[PDB]
Amino acid sequence: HHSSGLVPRGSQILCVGLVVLDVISLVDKYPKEDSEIRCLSQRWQRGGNASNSCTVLSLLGAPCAFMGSMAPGHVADFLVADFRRRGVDVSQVAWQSKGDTPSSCCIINNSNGNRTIVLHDTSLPDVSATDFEKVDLTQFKWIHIEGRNASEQVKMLQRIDAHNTRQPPEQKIRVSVEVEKPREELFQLFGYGDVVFVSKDVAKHLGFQSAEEALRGLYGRVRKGAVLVCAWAEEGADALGPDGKLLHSDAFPPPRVVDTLGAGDTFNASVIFSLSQGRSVQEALRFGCQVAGKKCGLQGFDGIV
Amino acid sequence: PRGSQILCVGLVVLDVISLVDKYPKEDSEIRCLSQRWQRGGNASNSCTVLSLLGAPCAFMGSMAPGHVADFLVADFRRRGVDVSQVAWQSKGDTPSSCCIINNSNGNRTIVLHDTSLPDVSATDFEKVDLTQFKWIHIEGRNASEQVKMLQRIDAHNTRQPPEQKIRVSVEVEKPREELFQLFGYGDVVFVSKDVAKHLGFQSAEEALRGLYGRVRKGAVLVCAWAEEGADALGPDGKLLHSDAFPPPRVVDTLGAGDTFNASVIFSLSQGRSVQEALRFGCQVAGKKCGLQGFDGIV
Ligand SMILES: OC[C@H]1CCN1c1nc(-c2cnn(C3CCNCC3)c2)cc(C(F)(F)F)n1
Ligand SMILES: OC[C@H]1CCN1c1nc(-c2cnn(C3CCNCC3)c2)cc(C(F)(F)F)n1
C-alpha cells in the first residue's frame, strides 16, 4: 500500500459504522416492473450514518476518522475519494476480501417526492471486535459508534472502557453510541457510552409518542452518569442526564426545506462536536438543532457552517 | 485482418445492477440479494456475446474519459473487444443506469441516465477503415447521422467484388419515428416487439408482414417476441419461425435481446441459413436468461 501521517495523540473524533454508495435517481413516474425509463437526474452520493457524521465533523473543523468495512473495487475508490474530498481520515477502514462494498439504489418520484429504495446487500462483514482490538486508541479523543453488529460492538465498547480505566481524566476517551434502527439486538447498546442517541423511529417503535416520553421511559437503560439524547425532527430535540432534568431545544427550520436527508447525522455530529469542545449539554443540544436546521435548507452538506 | 472482424456501433453504459427477490412497491424499501456492475448498452452487450462466441469483434461508440470509462474499457479488453474506434468525447459523463433484476422471473427494470454525451457522427464514421470488417451492426439512435454511415457502407460495397462485400445489420429497438428510415438499409433488419406493438402489430408474424414493405430489396426482417421465440421474413416471402429455448428458471433477461441479435449475426456471418441463425439466436438468448450476466452461455 503506502503510508499515513502522524496524528497528534488525543486529537481525532472517530465514527464507526456504515458507509454506502447511494445511486439516487429522480424520475417522472415510478417505473413499472420490466420497463426501461430515462431519469430526470442521477447522483452518486456517499451515505451511511457514521459516514455522514464524519463529513459534518470535518466541516465543523474537527480532525475526524471513519472506521467501517469496504471491499477493494471501484465502489470503494469512489467512496474513499469522496471521504478525502470532505477531509476525512480513512486509515482505519477495515478492508475485506469477501463481499461487496454496500451500494443502494434510491428512486425519487418527481411527482409526489416519494422514495423507493433497493437497499445494499449484506455480503460485506461488519468490523469485528477482533479487528477493533488491533487499533491503537490514543490518537482519538472521542469515539462514536453507530449501532449495527451490537454483540461485537459491545466488546469494542468494553475495550474502550478498559483503556479509560488506566487513563488520567484528561486522556479519557469520550464515547457515544447511536441506536437508530428499531432492531432488538441494538437495545443492549443503551447501556454503553457517555452519550446515547436514540432515534424518533426507535422511540415510536417502542410506543413512545414524544421525545419527553422516550427519554423518561428509556433513561433507566443507560449507564450511570450517561446523557440520553432524542431528536424529534421539526419538534427539535431533548436530552436527559443524571440530574434528572429534561433539557429541550426547539428546531431552527430554514426559510425553505430543501433536503432533510442526513439531518439526523448532522445533529448527532454537531452535538458530539459541541460536547467535545467542552460545552454544556444544553448548549450542545441547541447547537445540534441549529446546524441540522440549517442543513435542511441546503442540498447535501455544502454551506452547513 | 481484412474483413475478419464484426463491428458494432451503438451505446456502452455502466449497468449498476441489483438482484432482488421481488420488485419493490412504490414508496417501500427492500434489500437486494446481490449487487454487481456490468458493462452494458445494446451494441456493447452484443460485443460481449460475439466475443464469447469466438468472433473477433470491435465496438464503436462515445465514451468520456473518467473512472467509469476505465472500468468499461478494462471490461472490453478482458473480453478481447477492440476499442480502437471509440469516439472519445471531452464534453459529458459516461451514461449509467440502475438495473433492478427480479430473480423470480428475470424481469429487468432499467433507470437510464442519459448524460447528453454526443453520439457517434457520420464524420467519426468517415475516419473508420472499413476493410477490417466482414459485418457491421448499427444500433439505431441518431438516425440521419447513421443513415450517412450506412450510405457510406453501400458506396464502399459497390467498389467491391461480391467476394468481399460488407454485410450490414440495423436494430430499430426504441419506438421513435426518427428511426423508421433505418428499415431501408442493411441486409438484416432487427425490429423489436416494443416497436411492433407500438405500430399496432400483435405478433411477430403480423409485424413482419406489416413492415416488410419498408426494407430494401433483398433484406431479411427479423422480429423476436420474447418467450414466443422469433420470426424472420426474407425476399422469398416465406415466414420463418423458431420456438424459444426457455431455461426451467428464468433469472436474468437483461441483455437477452442483444444476445439474440449477436447470435443471429454470428450465425449468418458463418454462412448458416436464416432458419438456422434464428434458432441459434433463440438458443443462446434462452441459455443467457437462465444465468446472471453473460459468462457461461457457451
Ligand atoms: O433531524 C434532527 C432534528 C433536531 C433538529 N432537527 C431537524 N430535523 C428536521 C427533519 C428530520 N427529518 N425530517 C423529515 C421531514 C419529512 N417528514 C419526516 C421527517 C425533518 C427538520 C428540522 C427543522 F426543519 F425543523 F428545522 N430540524
Ligand atoms: O429476447 C430475444 C428472444 C428470442 C428468444 N428470446 C428470449 N427472450 C426472452 C425474454 C425477453 N424479455 N423477456 C421478459 C420476461 C418477463 N415478461 C416480459 C418480457 C423474456 C426470454 C426467452 C426465453 F426464456 F423464453 F427463452 N427467450
UniProtKB/Swiss-Prot annotation, chain A:
Summary of the tissues where the protein is detected: Most abundant in liver, kidney, gut, spleen and pancreas. Low levels also found in adrenal, muscle, brain and eye.
Reactions mediated catalytically: beta-D-fructose + ATP = beta-D-fructose 1-phosphate + ADP + H(+)
SUPFAM superfamilies to which the protein is assigned, alphabetical: Ribokinase-like
InterPro entries per record: Ketohexokinase-related, KHK, PfkB_dom, Ribokinase-like
EC number annotated for this UniProt entry: 2.7.1.3
Assembly, per entry: Homodimer.
CDD domains: Ketohexokinase
Any one of the GO BP annotations: response to glucose
Chain residues that bind ATP: 115, 233-236, 262-265
Keyword terms of this UniProt record: ATP-binding, Carbohydrate metabolism, Disease variant, Kinase, Nucleotide-binding, Transferase
Regulation: Requires potassium. Inhibition by ADP.
Domain of life: Eukaryota
Annotated protein name in UniProt: Ketohexokinase
One CC-aspect GO term: cytoplasm
Effect upon mutating residue 50 to T: In FRUCT; no effect on ketohexokinase function; decreases enzyme activity but no effect in substrate affinity; decreases thermal stability
Family recorded in the similarity comment: Belongs to the carbohydrate kinase PfkB family.
Gene this chain is encoded by: KHK
Residues that bind beta-D-fructose: 22, 48-49, 52, 265
Disease involvement: Fructosuria: Benign defect of intermediary metabolism.
Pathway stated in the Swiss-Prot or TrEMBL entry: Carbohydrate metabolism; fructose metabolism
Organism name: Homo sapiens
UniProtKB/Swiss-Prot annotation, chain B:
Function: Catalyzes the phosphorylation of the ketose sugar fructose to fructose-1-phosphate.
Gene Ontology biological-process entries: fructose metabolic process; regulation of glycogen metabolic process; response to fructose; response to glucose; response to insulin; response to sucrose; response to zinc ion
Record keyword Cytoplasm present: no
Effect of substituting residue 43 to T: In FRUCT; no effect on ketohexokinase function; decreases enzyme activity but no effect in substrate affinity; decreases thermal stability
Disease: Fructosuria: Benign defect of intermediary metabolism.
Regulation of its function: Requires potassium. Inhibition by ADP.
Keyword Nucleotide-binding assigned: yes
GO molecular function: ATP binding; fructose binding; identical protein binding; ketohexokinase activity; protein homodimerization activity
Pfam families the UniProt entry points to: PfkB
PANTHER family linked: KETOHEXOKINASE, PHOSPHOTRANSFERASE SYSTEM TRANSPORT PROTEIN
Keywords of this entry: ATP-binding, Carbohydrate metabolism, Disease variant, Kinase, Nucleotide-binding, Transferase
Superkingdom of origin organism: Eukaryota
InterPro entries reported for this sequence: Ketohexokinase-related, KHK, PfkB_dom, Ribokinase-like
Tissues showing expression: Most abundant in liver, kidney, gut, spleen and pancreas. Low levels also found in adrenal, muscle, brain and eye.
EC number(s) recorded for this UniProt protein: 2.7.1.3
Enzyme class: transferase
One term under GO cellular component: cytoplasm
Binding site for ATP: 108, 226-229, 255-258
Species per Swiss-Prot/TrEMBL record: Homo sapiens (Human)
Sequence positions that bind beta-D-fructose: 15, 41-42, 45, 258
Record protein name field: Ketohexokinase
Protein family (similarity comment): Belongs to the carbohydrate kinase PfkB family.
Complex and partners: Homodimer.
Catalysed reaction, written as an equation: beta-D-fructose + ATP = beta-D-fructose 1-phosphate + ADP + H(+)
